[PDB]
Amino acid sequence: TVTEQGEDITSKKDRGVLKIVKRVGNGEETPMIGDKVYVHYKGKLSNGKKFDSSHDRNEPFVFSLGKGQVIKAWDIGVATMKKGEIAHLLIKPEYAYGSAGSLPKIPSNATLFFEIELLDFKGE
Ligand SMILES: COc1cc2cc(OC)c1OCC/C=C/CCOC(=O)[C@@H]1CCCCN1C(=O)[C@H]2C1CCCCC1
């Protein structure tokens, strides 16, 4: 395997959000922009210095899709997912926290990885 593997799910096709489906979900419907989306996730910097999981809070992470409450890669990535799907996303800084980063959690120009389980989604 190669680091730059996965489907490029960016609109610009700049290989900045790469996705692999690890467990197939069900239903033909992905979430629409506006949906209240429920996930579990495990995230990290690619450099292995920080890890973050919804499981650390013992509760699902909830957010509204496409409202930019999360990084751009999540709005793009979760919109491709089906209920019950677990996916992996490798994210260049342009679809995460950019050259500014988000100190102290995220350094400048950081690449991020997430495993995301799409638990459920309901329309606003
Ligand atoms: C930059 O701030 C964080 C980033 C992440 C988790 C956080 O709290 C648990 C963070 O601090 C408090 C909540 C802030 C959320 C910022 C928005 O976060 C995000 O958009 C994405 C997707 C939703 C899960 C959280 N997340 C993050 O970038 C985490 C990172 C934490 C560090 C390892 C890489 C993930």
mmCIF file of C-alpha atoms and ligand atoms in Angstrom:
data_model
loop_
_atom_site.group_PDB
_atom_site.id
_atom_site.type_symbol
_atom_site.label_atom_id
_atom_site.label_comp_id
_atom_site.label_asym_id
_atom_site.label_seq_id
_atom_site.Cartn_x
_atom_site.Cartn_y
_atom_site.Cartn_z
ATOM 1 C CA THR A 1 0.000 0.000 0.000
ATOM 2 C CA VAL A 2 0.850 3.684 -0.674
ATOM 3 C CA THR A 3 0.054 6.745 1.525
ATOM 4 C CA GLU A 4 -1.742 8.540 -1.368
ATOM 5 C CA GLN A 5 -4.325 5.751 -1.761
ATOM 6 C CA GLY A 6 -8.131 6.095 -1.590
ATOM 7 C CA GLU A 7 -10.699 7.810 -3.824
ATOM 8 C CA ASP A 8 -10.272 11.567 -4.303
ATOM 9 C CA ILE A 9 -13.661 12.917 -3.232
ATOM 10 C CA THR A 10 -12.762 16.612 -3.765
ATOM 11 C CA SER A 11 -14.607 18.564 -6.413
ATOM 12 C CA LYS A 12 -11.350 20.105 -7.613
ATOM 13 C CA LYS A 13 -9.707 16.638 -7.888
ATOM 14 C CA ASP A 14 -6.551 17.798 -6.028
ATOM 15 C CA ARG A 15 -6.169 14.536 -4.074
ATOM 16 C CA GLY A 16 -6.635 16.540 -0.874
ATOM 17 C CA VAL A 17 -9.363 14.338 0.627
ATOM 18 C CA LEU A 18 -8.797 10.606 0.033
ATOM 19 C CA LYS A 19 -11.403 8.107 1.122
ATOM 20 C CA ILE A 20 -11.566 4.351 1.689
ATOM 21 C CA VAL A 21 -14.739 2.531 2.710
ATOM 22 C CA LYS A 22 -13.757 0.009 5.420
ATOM 23 C CA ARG A 23 -17.209 -1.330 6.299
ATOM 24 C CA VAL A 24 -20.049 -0.927 3.780
ATOM 25 C CA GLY A 25 -23.228 0.712 5.147
ATOM 26 C CA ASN A 26 -26.788 0.179 3.813
ATOM 27 C CA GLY A 27 -29.544 2.201 2.113
ATOM 28 C CA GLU A 28 -29.026 4.142 -1.137
ATOM 29 C CA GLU A 29 -29.229 7.530 0.645
ATOM 30 C CA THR A 30 -26.266 9.618 1.705
ATOM 31 C CA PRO A 31 -26.995 12.662 3.933
ATOM 32 C CA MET A 32 -28.136 15.951 2.343
ATOM 33 C CA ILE A 33 -26.655 19.335 3.327
ATOM 34 C CA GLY A 34 -28.508 20.420 6.490
ATOM 35 C CA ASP A 35 -28.956 16.929 8.004
ATOM 36 C CA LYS A 36 -28.225 16.442 11.714
ATOM 37 C CA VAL A 37 -25.514 13.765 11.461
ATOM 38 C CA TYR A 38 -24.429 11.365 14.209
ATOM 39 C CA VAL A 39 -20.970 9.710 14.027
ATOM 40 C CA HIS A 40 -18.314 8.019 16.076
ATOM 41 C CA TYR A 41 -14.752 8.807 15.032
ATOM 42 C CA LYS A 42 -11.108 8.226 15.787
ATOM 43 C CA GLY A 43 -8.793 10.941 14.551
ATOM 44 C CA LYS A 44 -5.109 11.764 14.653
ATOM 45 C CA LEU A 45 -2.372 13.861 13.148
ATOM 46 C CA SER A 46 -0.451 11.777 10.590
ATOM 47 C CA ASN A 47 2.744 12.508 12.566
ATOM 48 C CA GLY A 48 1.332 10.368 15.430
ATOM 49 C CA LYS A 49 1.621 13.067 18.123
ATOM 50 C CA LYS A 50 -2.124 13.626 18.872
ATOM 51 C CA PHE A 51 -5.144 11.273 18.908
ATOM 52 C CA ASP A 52 -8.767 12.158 19.514
ATOM 53 C CA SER A 53 -11.823 9.909 19.696
ATOM 54 C CA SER A 54 -15.533 10.443 20.293
ATOM 55 C CA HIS A 55 -15.177 7.364 22.529
ATOM 56 C CA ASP A 56 -13.029 9.478 24.900
ATOM 57 C CA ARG A 57 -16.237 11.433 25.676
ATOM 58 C CA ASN A 58 -18.386 8.244 25.821
ATOM 59 C CA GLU A 59 -20.917 9.849 23.434
ATOM 60 C CA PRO A 60 -21.561 10.147 19.658
ATOM 61 C CA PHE A 61 -20.330 13.294 17.937
ATOM 62 C CA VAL A 62 -23.235 15.234 16.431
ATOM 63 C CA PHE A 63 -23.024 18.070 13.878
ATOM 64 C CA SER A 64 -25.047 19.614 11.028
ATOM 65 C CA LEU A 65 -23.758 18.654 7.579
ATOM 66 C CA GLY A 66 -22.433 21.436 5.336
ATOM 67 C CA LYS A 67 -22.894 24.164 7.973
ATOM 68 C CA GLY A 68 -19.052 24.293 8.305
ATOM 69 C CA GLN A 69 -19.163 23.248 12.015
ATOM 70 C CA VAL A 70 -16.423 20.766 11.124
ATOM 71 C CA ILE A 71 -13.510 20.926 8.728
ATOM 72 C CA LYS A 72 -14.253 21.008 4.992
ATOM 73 C CA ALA A 73 -13.096 17.378 4.564
ATOM 74 C CA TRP A 74 -15.803 16.191 6.968
ATOM 75 C CA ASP A 75 -18.588 18.069 5.185
ATOM 76 C CA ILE A 76 -17.353 16.584 1.904
ATOM 77 C CA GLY A 77 -16.581 13.159 3.319
ATOM 78 C CA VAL A 78 -19.595 12.465 5.478
ATOM 79 C CA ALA A 79 -21.878 13.573 2.595
ATOM 80 C CA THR A 80 -20.561 10.523 0.660
ATOM 81 C CA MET A 81 -21.302 8.014 3.448
ATOM 82 C CA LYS A 82 -24.196 5.607 4.106
ATOM 83 C CA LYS A 83 -25.700 4.661 7.483
ATOM 84 C CA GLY A 84 -23.558 2.067 9.267
ATOM 85 C CA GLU A 85 -20.554 2.819 6.982
ATOM 86 C CA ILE A 86 -17.104 3.079 8.475
ATOM 87 C CA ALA A 87 -14.739 5.096 6.285
ATOM 88 C CA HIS A 88 -11.175 6.403 6.466
ATOM 89 C CA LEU A 89 -10.255 9.894 5.291
ATOM 90 C CA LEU A 90 -6.712 11.230 4.688
ATOM 91 C CA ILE A 91 -6.864 14.953 4.630
ATOM 92 C CA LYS A 92 -4.384 17.524 3.385
ATOM 93 C CA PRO A 93 -4.252 20.839 5.329
ATOM 94 C CA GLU A 94 -6.267 22.734 2.693
ATOM 95 C CA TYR A 95 -9.390 20.727 3.784
ATOM 96 C CA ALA A 96 -8.557 20.887 7.515
ATOM 97 C CA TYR A 97 -6.761 23.694 9.379
ATOM 98 C CA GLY A 98 -4.608 25.232 6.665
ATOM 99 C CA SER A 99 -1.346 27.101 7.017
ATOM 100 C CA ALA A 100 -2.714 28.852 10.164
ATOM 101 C CA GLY A 101 -3.388 25.513 11.874
ATOM 102 C CA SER A 102 -5.293 25.508 15.125
ATOM 103 C CA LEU A 103 -2.887 25.745 18.018
ATOM 104 C CA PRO A 104 -2.296 24.203 20.372
ATOM 105 C CA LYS A 105 -4.120 21.114 19.009
ATOM 106 C CA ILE A 106 -3.195 21.280 15.310
ATOM 107 C CA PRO A 107 0.159 22.568 13.881
ATOM 108 C CA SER A 108 0.477 24.579 10.669
ATOM 109 C CA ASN A 109 0.059 22.514 7.496
ATOM 110 C CA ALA A 110 -1.065 19.341 9.310
ATOM 111 C CA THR A 111 -2.336 16.234 7.497
ATOM 112 C CA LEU A 112 -5.117 14.453 9.412
ATOM 113 C CA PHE A 113 -6.540 10.953 9.393
ATOM 114 C CA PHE A 114 -9.970 9.898 10.597
ATOM 115 C CA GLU A 115 -11.908 6.729 10.928
ATOM 116 C CA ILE A 116 -15.581 7.686 10.862
ATOM 117 C CA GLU A 117 -18.580 5.548 11.656
ATOM 118 C CA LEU A 118 -21.811 7.065 10.294
ATOM 119 C CA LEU A 119 -24.281 6.017 13.014
ATOM 120 C CA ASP A 120 -27.410 7.916 11.901
ATOM 121 C CA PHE A 121 -28.685 11.061 10.167
ATOM 122 C CA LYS A 122 -32.031 12.920 10.432
ATOM 123 C CA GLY A 123 -33.267 15.788 8.224
ATOM 124 C CA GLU A 124 -33.453 19.142 10.099
HETATM 125 C C1 LIG B 1 -9.133 22.106 16.734
HETATM 126 O O1 LIG B 1 -9.976 21.681 17.807
HETATM 127 C C2 LIG B 1 -10.270 20.323 17.906
HETATM 128 C C3 LIG B 1 -10.023 19.413 16.926
HETATM 129 C C4 LIG B 1 -10.408 18.075 17.126
HETATM 130 C C5 LIG B 1 -10.992 17.723 18.393
HETATM 131 C C6 LIG B 1 -11.237 18.673 19.389
HETATM 132 O O2 LIG B 1 -11.843 18.470 20.680
HETATM 133 C C7 LIG B 1 -12.035 17.099 21.034
HETATM 134 C C8 LIG B 1 -10.862 19.954 19.117
HETATM 135 O O3 LIG B 1 -11.084 20.947 20.057
HETATM 136 C C9 LIG B 1 -12.469 21.249 20.589
HETATM 137 C C10 LIG B 1 -13.567 20.995 19.485
HETATM 138 C C11 LIG B 1 -13.089 21.683 18.381
HETATM 139 C C12 LIG B 1 -13.423 21.214 17.127
HETATM 140 C C13 LIG B 1 -12.818 21.752 15.957
HETATM 141 C C14 LIG B 1 -13.518 21.098 14.787
HETATM 142 O O4 LIG B 1 -13.003 19.709 14.723
HETATM 143 C C15 LIG B 1 -13.196 19.106 13.461
HETATM 144 O O5 LIG B 1 -13.764 19.690 12.571
HETATM 145 C C16 LIG B 1 -12.785 17.782 13.272
HETATM 146 C C17 LIG B 1 -13.974 16.854 12.847
HETATM 147 C C18 LIG B 1 -14.854 16.635 14.094
HETATM 148 C C19 LIG B 1 -14.100 15.893 15.108
HETATM 149 C C20 LIG B 1 -12.993 16.829 15.665
HETATM 150 N N1 LIG B 1 -12.089 17.344 14.573
HETATM 151 C C21 LIG B 1 -10.733 17.529 14.825
HETATM 152 O O6 LIG B 1 -9.992 18.103 14.010
HETATM 153 C C22 LIG B 1 -10.147 17.107 16.119
HETATM 154 C C23 LIG B 1 -8.645 16.744 15.958
HETATM 155 C C24 LIG B 1 -7.956 16.600 17.360
HETATM 156 C C25 LIG B 1 -6.577 16.257 17.155
HETATM 157 C C26 LIG B 1 -6.344 14.989 16.374
HETATM 158 C C27 LIG B 1 -7.038 15.220 14.978
HETATM 159 C C28 LIG B 1 -8.494 15.464 15.162
#
